[PDB]
Amino acid sequence: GKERFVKLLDQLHNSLRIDLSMYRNNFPASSPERLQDLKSTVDLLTSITFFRMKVQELQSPPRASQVVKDCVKACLNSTYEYIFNNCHELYGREYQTDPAKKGEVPPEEQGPSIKNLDFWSKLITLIVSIIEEDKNSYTPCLNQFPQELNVGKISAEVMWSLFAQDMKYAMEEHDKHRLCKSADYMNLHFKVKWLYNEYVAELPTFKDRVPEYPAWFEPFVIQWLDENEEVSRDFLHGALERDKKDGFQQTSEHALFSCSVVDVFSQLNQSFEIIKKLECPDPQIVGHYMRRFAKTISNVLLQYADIVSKDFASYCSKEKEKVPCILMNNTQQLRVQLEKMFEAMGGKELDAEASGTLKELQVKLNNVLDELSHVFATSFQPHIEECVRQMGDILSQVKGTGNVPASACSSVAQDADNVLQPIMDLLDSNLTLFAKICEKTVLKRVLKELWKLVMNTMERTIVLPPEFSKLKDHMVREEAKSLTPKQCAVVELALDTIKQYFHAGGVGLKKTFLEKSPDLQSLRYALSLYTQATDLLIK
């Protein structure tokens, strides 16, 4: 009786749920009238459900929003299956303009191939068509429970989830085989990010971080990173040769370095820009990519440095004196634009291992500058020793002449200029060439090296330290031949003058460094043996 009735409702509720579990197919979006029937059909279902909630005062928990939702999920599962089984014909019919539109060629039907990634880009396009359909078409249609039934939001989650379990498995498959170009896995990783961020990422289920999807691609980018390191190496050779053939012209009068430096950092940056555009949302993975790119950056820059040191001495023949100055300028530039890269990879936020690979590089790079300046300063040494023995001769010719009115007598001040003159052609011709064409950090480094060499050579050449000879049983150092008082004064004043030329006002080394310089003190102590005539006891 009333039992005949309750069976009859269950049968009608059931019939409608069956209709709704294929809504896309049973109520195509193409038909406005048929979309009305879909609305009417959800209405009739809610009314039945509602009446059961009341008159069938017995609990009827199937609340209508849940029933429609579960029906919609079914239609979606079906849709996904239709889409996945007809990927090709659906895609070529509609989205392929296009040259060689023919199809249908590759059974086993492209979805998925392991030779090729094409099927997945097509399937992603078709997935979007549906989600957009469920947002644009069906959601307005089924507004009856806006708080609890957003068809488009459901379309996105279900379609993403279904697509995701397949893609996961397909990537595991390609991880074992790797038959595609990395550029292909790279483009897919990209197209998938767009899809996730565009439709899934703001969904409640997912709004809480962090997505699985990047891990599916992690191995394939690490491979692209490897291939990429090797392309960076080949770019670097013949980035220099273009520059070496061009003779290392500075790029501009403001611009202290040659073109090859901007090329290497442009290409290192383009590669970094690629990774940045994945917008990888898993920090453990992003730290992994950074770790590995830091290895690339290091081997590339070191290759840049190793390539000059190998060649540097060859440029130190004095005919082309600016060029060696530029390479140091270039090497300095590596140090600074690397810092700029280091920040772009996140600074302190950067993964520690990556941050350490780079700071260890920043150090090794700066040691290359040192060796490099030192080779340059030593490029002069022979000409310095010739300059210094030549100035020790003049000092030996210094003598007091005032004894007779002889008013042509040369003052200590004059005698000092005459002693310095043979080395002066260095200081004018060159130290005003250098600061003209040197990074500040670079010039400071070269001057500190030249200064060492001058105080070194003088401690050897004009001192003429006394020799050992046998004296009774054993070898003992002979007493120093003292300089004459005039000579003492000429040497002192000469030395102080030389220290000033390096100070260069403020332009050169600071007075503080020169005074403390152990090469100056080693020289001053050497002088002191010779200098006894004017040295004060009790300063």
From Swiss-Prot:
Domain MHD2 residue range list: 417-539
Reported effect, residue 249 to R: Loss of binding to STX1B and priming activity
Localization in the cell: Cytoplasm; Cell membrane; Presynaptic cell membrane; Presynaptic active zone
Tissue-specificity statement: Expressed in brain, with highest levels in the olfactory bulb, striatum, cerebral cortex, hippocampus and cerebellum. Also expressed in pancreatic islet cells.
Domain MHD1: 165-308
Subunit structure, interactors included: Interacts with the N-termini of STX1A and/or STX1B1 and DOC2A. Interacts with BSN. Interacts with RIMS1 which recruits UNC13A to the active zone. Forms homodimers via its first C2 domain. Also interacts via this domain with the zinc finger domain of RIMS2. Part of a complex consisting of ERC2, RIMS1 and UNC13A. Also part of a complex consisting of UNC13A, RIMS2 and RAB3A. Interacts with FBXO45 (via SRY domain); leading to the degradation of UNC13A by the proteasome.
Family affiliation: Belongs to the unc-13 family.
Primary role: Plays a role in vesicle maturation during exocytosis as a target of the diacylglycerol second messenger pathway. Involved in neurotransmitter release by acting in synaptic vesicle priming prior to vesicle fusion and participates in the activity-dependent refilling of readily releasable vesicle pool (RRP). Essential for synaptic vesicle maturation in most excitatory/glutamatergic but not inhibitory/GABA-mediated synapses. Facilitates neuronal dense core vesicles fusion as well as controls the location and efficiency of their synaptic release.
Entry note about domains: The C2 domains are not involved in calcium-dependent phospholipid binding. The C-terminal region containing both MHD domains and the third C2 domain is required for synaptic vesicle priming activity.
Descriptive protein name: Protein unc-13 homolog A
Source organism: Rattus norvegicus
Residues of the full protein shown: 942 to 1523 of 1735
